[PDB]
Design an enzyme around this catalytic site. Sequence first.
Site, PDB file in Angstrom:
ATOM      1  N   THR A  22      -3.193   3.032  -7.720  1.00 53.66           N
ATOM      2  CA  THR A  22      -4.281   3.163  -7.060  1.00 53.66           C
ATOM      3  C   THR A  22      -4.087   4.826  -8.277  1.00 53.66           C
ATOM      4  O   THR A  22      -4.777   5.093  -8.513  1.00 53.66           O
ATOM      5  CB  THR A  22      -4.359   3.740  -5.645  1.00 53.66           C
ATOM      6  OG1 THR A  22      -3.820   4.649  -5.180  1.00 53.66           O
ATOM      7  CG2 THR A  22      -4.750   2.858  -5.237  1.00 53.66           C
ATOM      8  N   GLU A  59       1.505  -9.337   2.439  1.00 57.18           N
ATOM      9  CA  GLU A  59       1.811  -8.042   3.621  1.00 57.18           C
ATOM     10  C   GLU A  59       2.331  -8.839   4.607  1.00 57.18           C
ATOM     11  O   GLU A  59       1.419  -9.641   5.334  1.00 57.18           O
ATOM     12  CB  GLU A  59       1.343  -6.603   3.227  1.00 57.18           C
ATOM     13  CG  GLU A  59       1.847  -6.048   2.528  1.00 57.18           C
ATOM     14  CD  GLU A  59       3.137  -5.649   3.521  1.00 57.18           C
ATOM     15  OE1 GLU A  59       3.441  -4.632   4.467  1.00 57.18           O
ATOM     16  OE2 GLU A  59       4.093  -5.805   2.783  1.00 57.18           O
ATOM     17  N   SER A  95      -3.902   6.417   1.224  1.00 58.79           N
ATOM     18  CA  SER A  95      -4.458   4.958   0.724  1.00 58.79           C
ATOM     19  C   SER A  95      -5.409   4.209   0.769  1.00 58.79           C
ATOM     20  O   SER A  95      -6.349   5.322   1.545  1.00 58.79           O
ATOM     21  CB  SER A  95      -3.144   3.948   2.061  1.00 58.79           C
ATOM     22  OG  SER A  95      -3.422   3.083   2.492  1.00 58.79           O
ATOM     23  N   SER A  96      -5.731   3.318  -0.202  1.00 58.76           N
ATOM     24  CA  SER A  96      -6.628   2.772  -0.665  1.00 58.76           C
ATOM     25  C   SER A  96      -6.750   1.835   0.268  1.00 58.76           C
ATOM     26  O   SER A  96      -6.089   0.986   1.377  1.00 58.76           O
ATOM     27  CB  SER A  96      -6.641   2.126  -1.903  1.00 58.76           C
ATOM     28  OG  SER A  96      -6.715   3.302  -2.657  1.00 58.76           O
ATOM     29  N   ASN A 106       1.290   6.017   2.749  1.00 62.02           N
ATOM     30  CA  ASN A 106       0.338   7.005   1.989  1.00 62.02           C
ATOM     31  C   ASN A 106      -0.757   8.355   2.585  1.00 62.02           C
ATOM     32  O   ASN A 106      -1.605   7.530   3.639  1.00 62.02           O
ATOM     33  CB  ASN A 106      -0.105   6.230   0.679  1.00 62.02           C
ATOM     34  CG  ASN A 106       0.538   7.610  -0.348  1.00 62.02           C
ATOM     35  OD1 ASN A 106       1.033   8.689   0.057  1.00 62.02           O
ATOM     36  ND2 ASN A 106       0.477   6.847  -1.526  1.00 62.02           N
ATOM     37  N   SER A 148       0.908  -1.461   0.034  1.00 57.94           N
ATOM     38  CA  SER A 148      -0.382   0.387  -0.179  1.00 57.94           C
ATOM     39  C   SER A 148       0.786   1.524  -0.528  1.00 57.94           C
ATOM     40  O   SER A 148       2.077   1.633   0.848  1.00 57.94           O
ATOM     41  CB  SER A 148      -1.082   0.458   0.455  1.00 57.94           C
ATOM     42  OG  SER A 148      -1.850  -0.971   1.048  1.00 57.94           O
ATOM     43  N   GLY A 149       0.475   2.146  -0.878  1.00 53.19           N
ATOM     44  CA  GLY A 149       1.216   3.995  -0.964  1.00 53.19           C
ATOM     45  C   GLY A 149       2.697   3.231  -1.653  1.00 53.19           C
ATOM     46  O   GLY A 149       3.923   3.411  -1.172  1.00 53.19           O
ATOM     47  N   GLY A 187      -0.218  -7.333  -3.055  1.00 46.48           N
ATOM     48  CA  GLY A 187      -0.209  -8.381  -2.618  1.00 46.48           C
ATOM     49  C   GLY A 187       0.241  -9.065  -1.328  1.00 46.48           C
ATOM     50  O   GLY A 187      -0.349  -8.081  -0.391  1.00 46.48           O
TER      51      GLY A 187
END
Length: 758
Positions: free
Chosen positions: A185, A458, A235-236, A232, A180-181, A456
């Site tokens: 996105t 984590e 961040s989604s 981020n 993420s980040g 992916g």
Amino acid sequence: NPIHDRTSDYHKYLKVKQGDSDLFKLTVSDKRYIWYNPDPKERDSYECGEIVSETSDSFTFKTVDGQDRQVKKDDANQRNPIKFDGVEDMSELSYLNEPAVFHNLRVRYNQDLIYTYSGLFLVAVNPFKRIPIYTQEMVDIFKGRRRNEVAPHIFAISDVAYRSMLDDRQNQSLLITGESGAGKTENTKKVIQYLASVAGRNQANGSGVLEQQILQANPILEAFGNAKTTRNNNSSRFGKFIEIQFNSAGFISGASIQSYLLEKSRVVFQSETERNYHIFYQLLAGATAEEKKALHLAGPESFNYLNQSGCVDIKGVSDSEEFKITRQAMDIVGFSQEEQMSIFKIIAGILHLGNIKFEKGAGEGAVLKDKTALNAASTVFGVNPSVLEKALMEPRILAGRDLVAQHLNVEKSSSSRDALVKALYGRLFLWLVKKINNVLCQERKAYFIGVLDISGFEIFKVNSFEQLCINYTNEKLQQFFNHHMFKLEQEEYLKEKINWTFIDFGLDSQATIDLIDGRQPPGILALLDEQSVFPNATDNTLITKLHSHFSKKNAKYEEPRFSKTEFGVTHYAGQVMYEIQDWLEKNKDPLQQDLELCFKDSSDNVVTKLFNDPNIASRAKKGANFITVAAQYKEQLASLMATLETTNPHFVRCIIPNNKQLPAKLEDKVVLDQLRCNAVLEGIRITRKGFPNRIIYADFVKRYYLLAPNVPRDAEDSQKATDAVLKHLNIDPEQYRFGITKIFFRAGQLARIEEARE
């Protein structure tokens, strides 16, 4: 200003500045180096070597600190010739070591070249900076261009997917994944941007209203699906599978959005240095004078759901301003101005439920002495505060055949409150997307280009049930990649006259998949399901079952030595320790029927289809009640793959250079172990069994010619046009597999043929 003018922004930002001359007077190497590491134990820190004694045992390379260590042909990470530094396709690197691959995008990165092709992969490193390469002038440059015909860019892999749909008349898919980040996105947004252009439906240059609805269905989903975190500032907190649909002519005709794994917890609890979802803050700073009192609002800090996380206002932008684009995009896609207040009233109500501080009364059981926030909370909703009151502190239970009201202590009278909040938000968001599809999805979609956006593997500090899901998804996507490689690898195995020896992979990834969703013997998800049907079973027995089923009886399973609550699963990326805890509760998403039937008849037009319609408030009906969260997940994932298998995929892998959000900061440790969290390197290593110089057809024919008396410049057919500089020079049937039809090249040993005087 095409590929021609060398002073264009295209040459400036997407290309390695192109010198002059070309012949024997351009940087030339005549020696050999290597990638060694000054620190023996520390893996992720390397340094340039010197190879001074060849002897086919080991390499006695020199160093830089003057000393002379050694190593053999098991760790020698021979570095590639410098003329390769900068290559846009790692599929040509004579050597494919870890440091070699890291050095290329390291050189690419320092020149602000963030896009790089690694095999069939598209690698992109998060620049944490503003690279001006996403202009309209840029889009026009990639139109009708081929992969090897231009420089690496998200537009390049986008156009290629579009052209293939029109030519092959097949469906396409893009798989953008990574931490993420890390770039995603945003990349997926550029994909939609580009597609809105090439396949746009406007007279002159713009949208046809329809296009905007798509381009505008984005700001909304970010308002409810995004927040600032340690990775981020955007961040989604969800995954998504966007399908862009066309007609036969090749014109964008509609789209549909798919949602996954929304982070329900964030609503009630945000972490340190992080904040809650944007929608909350945009409302407060955005809503005008009267709207605030209408829903009974106050400061962005006077709410228990927004104060404890030590942060409120983010660094770089305001909120009231972005609340404009939110309500703006909301009326572009089509949302009743009244339906928008309804959406906000829920966002506002959620705030007041968080402000209900439960106090202790007569012995056990709580008491809401101060009925201040609940009243306001019940106001915006349209529910009976009286029944809501005791439906949250005195719900009924079906113990036996008796149905008794029950007073609850503060802990459980507070848990039920948070469970009520999550359910609401999780359904509202589930309602948003639903309304967007009916305004954009279609009936007779000809073809589609899908964009899968999800992270992916984590490994966090404490892995919980939501990590098992995505790691389970990744196990399939990674299996999908390795399997897709068979098909093709076998194809260009055919048109080479001589055909390669049948080679298989049954994919060792099937083992881990069996351990998770397998039926017989039962897997984790199976044993977990049987454990949930009982209004009794705990978290201790839950793991007691697993350990009795898989410990010492399954390769991919492991029982911790001193831990009494965890278990380890060996994935494609490595082992991940999972914590049990509330799996048994979150696997069923319990909501006391009283709170359900309390809201199920409220005064509103929106908040009711959330509790009244089973398409939003329930799950698939089979046998007992509806299904489990883990059951639905396995199903939806399976459905996702069914579609994926129907398409022709393209793979994009996002990367982050550092954990500080800084430009010009390429951390070895961080970046290096991230090329293994994903495998973009191993993807090519499998072709290394045949040829690791993957590129177009024969270039030794159409590139070199000055070489000493051996091969001419212009001969008759590009197959054996250079029939001497690569055979009679100590070669035979043993290199590139070229009979008489087609192939790709081999560069493994390529170093003895050229490196000195012509």
